[PDB]
Symmetry: C4
Subunit: 252 residues, 4 copies
């Protein structure tokens, strides 16, 4: 099936960005203040997004983001039947990409806090895979950051893949989206490796539930796990209206 081929490309693409992105967070977290800080995490996530789009772009268009897929279906650019398949294909691959990172750092992760896995705290390793609320990442503060960050990502994506504009060459899309992701982490959020991808957050978080961290990965932070899912979905809706009201509606 043609739609099965595109789902496989989205699965591999989201595997690349999660495996590369979570591996750099594991390097910083496990080697406390020795192998870089936030700059190397931001560049790795931005570079991984560029690489993942180049690999999977020629098949499925390389959305690699349920929020981006939701925005495409909202504008009727893609059928609504692509939304559940892409979301499932993107979540699977973030789950698999998290497993590869777990295998890479299996001994270092288990030795971070003796011989047990801790979700949050000073000796906490669950934050390598999924985001957890810090002092300045409360429910209200975190919701606003993910809403604005996803709206900015949607506007930049729509401005590059616009049919009414000149057909962009290959590579330009990959390096543009990797540029937005790099600058969103640098600017938005006091502490956020990546908070604009619902699949990049739920997939690895679901892996840690079964990897041995327990069910505390969902109940911690007053059930914060649904914030990195709903807020980027709302932010993609806001980013569509901004692009249409500023640029899109006048291109007719």
């Amino acid at each position: 099936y043609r739609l099965l081929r595109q789902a496989l490309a989205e699965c591999l693409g989201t595997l690349i960005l999660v495996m590369f992105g979570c591996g750099s967070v594991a390097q910083v977290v496990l080697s406390r203040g020795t192998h870089g800080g936030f700059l190397t995490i931001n560049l790795a996530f931005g570079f991984a997004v560029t690489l993942a789009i180049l690999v999977a772009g020629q098949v499925s268009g390389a959305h690699l983001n349920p929020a981006v897929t939701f925005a495409m279906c909202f504008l009727a650019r893609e059928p609504w039947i692509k939304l559940p398949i892409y979301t499932l294909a993107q979540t699977l691959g973030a789950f698999l990409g998290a497993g590869i990172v777990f295998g890479l750092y299996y001994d270092a992760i288990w030795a971070f806090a003796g011989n047990e896995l801790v979700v949050s705290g000073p000796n906490g390793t669950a934050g390598i895979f999924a985001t957890y609320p810090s002092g300045h990442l409360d429910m209200v503060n975190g919701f606003f950051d993910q809403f604005i960050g996803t709206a900015a990502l949607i506007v930049c994506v729509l401005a590059i893949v616009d049919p009414y504009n000149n057909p962009v060459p290959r590579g330009l899309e990959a390096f543009t989206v990797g540029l937005v992701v790099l600058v969103i982490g640098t600017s938005m959020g006091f502490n956020s490796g990546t908070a604009v991808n619902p699949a990049r957050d739920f997939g690895p978080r679901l892996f840690t539930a079964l990897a041995g961290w327990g069910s505390e990965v969902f109940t911690t932070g007053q059930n914060w796990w649904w914030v990195p899912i709903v807020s980027p979905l709302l932010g993609s809706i806001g980013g569509v209206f901004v692009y249409q009201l500023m640029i899109g509606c006048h291109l007719e």
Copy 2:
């Protein structure tokens, strides 16, 4: 109206660079010496300029700078009626981009100096949005830096958008201008996140006047606020003569 469509693209483009640029300054300023220094500020401003040009380039040409627009009208490449509309459209968006950054860091900004907003000093947050004169950024020292930095930016822009040369592809313009902005901050000025854009300085400064910082944002530093406006305008005139005398006049 056709000229209304171009004004909307300039408004959104200047919103992107101010929101991304001021967000990275807020990260460094609020988290004192923890989330990077001047290198991350310079890269973010350079990357934001590249992103803003890519988004708004296909409509208005993505000047995103009143000095660049003034240089274009000086060379009779654009009508003089575009200068006031673009300047107003660029200033609005730097005003809106500053408001988004204020919302993102609302609790952190208010808690930097207790429960009040301070313009300048050790616990000063008004420098996140607009430039203020430091020890080595006096009136004479600051004027020379903005004059030279804007002259260098104009020459590089004119050399890329030159009709007499080969038609440059899309993306080349965006990455070239983002390269100039990145290297101007690294080289020119002992301390300057961005000092080559009059709209990027006056817009956010006007926001802080009404946001709660008071009217001290204009009277501080012996009324320094007009320097980041007049000096880049004069520097753009100087950059036009340099390009014409070196390259432009001999392309006939």
Copy 3:
């Protein structure tokens, strides 16, 4: 002979990446914690790979990696007679590139530990040219990192040079492969400047055996020298199956 011209391009290309890559490691190792850390090493190796592909790409395709050449012959894209010649041509050039770095830092290297060459330890200089097992780079831990890193490199290379996709422009291949190498070092491995190139590891290691470090460069670490050779070769096989099962087989 046509196949002799391609071997000469592979020899020069592998010389560039080893000479540039090992020179940056020598800067960090000899100047202990003064001239950068792991970020500058990673960028230099990534930039050197981009430069080496641009120089040698137009002649031999710029594999510059026996694992990449092995993957190409496995997919029957190149004849099996190219594998031994390219591997010999890639190993010679890593040997010569290591000699140039030895000449550049001849006095600094000899003065690192008095007036003698030490393979491993605190005053050890043999790690400039070849990788040696650290605390978290044991046989099992090291084998897994090189297997995964080479599988990721193969998938990205196959997705760019795919005949069934659109013909990529020049430069896109060079910057893509340099991006994978940069992000592999940042993410995979707790400490690895480059561990995805068998020629980049054996060539410089063979040079140190004759340069004066002795035969200890092979017997150290329970004979670790064969791990950076066999594991990337197996990883390239794994990367071929992943690409074929996800993307390649459905492009017919």
Copy 4:
């Protein structure tokens, strides 16, 4: 005259790279260990070379290097009458670019050592404009670094501007040469902001002789001033033979 137009482009191009390059060295040197280190100096010099080629490339080909011009005339690609005019045009502009940096940092430079200009030492500012021999930059050690660095630069330039290869697009040349310069500083030399351009070294050094530093800028270091001139010229000869023997001679 046609050859006068090309000389003016070379003058402006070398002005850009010296003004941007020396400004970043002044930031690091004057603000001791506060505004970055060697990484920001290397990126600025690499980015300035990319910018200078883009501005002046369409007119004169943007050699911006007497060693590159000498290599072009050696291969009979350009007439020998271009060598003295380009060298004079490149040296003038490095002289002017140094004057702009002197004006930018006039008060900071004079206050580095009280109220006098010192060539070398702890409070020395002449090293902002020209290279001076450090502990590991002796005559023999320095000569080898500049010879190898210029040979590597020539090979990369010849591989990109080769007529026998596919015609490279604009921008690819500028970003390639800026990549070589960035990685030469990172790898070659224990301490070298840029040591592959004879005009970038003699021009600013001649400015400091008349700016107030005195004639000590030539007699210091056992008359080291001629090393950054002769050695890159010899290195360009070596880089031509390497490229011809590896790639060039077999492209017929």
